[PDB]
A and B are shown apart, each in its own frame.
Chain A
Amino acid sequence: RNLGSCGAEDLDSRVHPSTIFWPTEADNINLASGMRETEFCTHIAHKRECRICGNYNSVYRKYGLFICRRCFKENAGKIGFVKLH
């Protein structure tokens, strides 16, 4: 299909070149650098997940943590958060 092409009036209407505003959330560099490969994971979307227990529900993005709430009360003492007042 490397030689196919369509009417130019059907090619000026392709999408905006400015890539996409749907990149995956990567905390560090260790995640990535950026046949079935044609569609294995083309659905590019956010996947931010607890950096402890790897869960996509109830993640505190505030202050750039990305820590679930249940995976947080345990480690709060280690991190530095203290329960006073």
Chain B
Amino acid sequence: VHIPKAVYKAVYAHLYENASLALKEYWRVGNVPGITYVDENGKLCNPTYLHVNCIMQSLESRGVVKDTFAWRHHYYLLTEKGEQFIRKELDLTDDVLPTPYSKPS
């Protein structure tokens, strides 16, 4: 619950770069192998499931992203509003766009 700002920025940046978040329905103690950050820790460290789950819950409840549970994985996707929000925190400007807008190829 005492989530550092670095985790917030890392999550948001991964969101923007892949416009997505294929997360797991997990509640024990563990580390996400994808998103990673290097701050205070001094090296690119993973975050813990509890923090990210709380953050994404807040995001969804706020309408920024929407989910689509299937088996045991959460699949989130961000909307136009979310794009118009994430852009603000990461010091972005309107012109910059997410990567999938362009061709994956």
| A63 within 8 Å of B (CB atoms) | no
On chain B, the number of residues with a Cβ less than 8 Å from chain A's Cβ atoms is 15
Judging by beta carbons under 8 Å apart, are B31 and A37 in contact? Answer: no
Judging by beta carbons under 8 Å apart, are A52 and B71 in contact? Answer: yes
**Distance between Cα atoms of A52 and B32 in the complex (Å):** 20
Judging by beta carbons under 8 Å apart, are B33 and A29 in contact? Answer: yes
B residues neighboring A (CB under 8 Å): 22, 24-26, 28-33, 46, 49, 71-73
15 new A-B pairs (CB below 8 Å) besides A32-B28, A40-B29? A24-B28, A30-B32, A30-B33, A30-B73, A31-B24, A31-B26, A31-B30, A32-B26, A32-B49, A33-B31, A33-B32, A34-B31, A51-B71, A52-B72, A54-B25
A residues neighboring B (CB under 8 Å): 24, 29-34, 37, 40-41, 51-52, 54
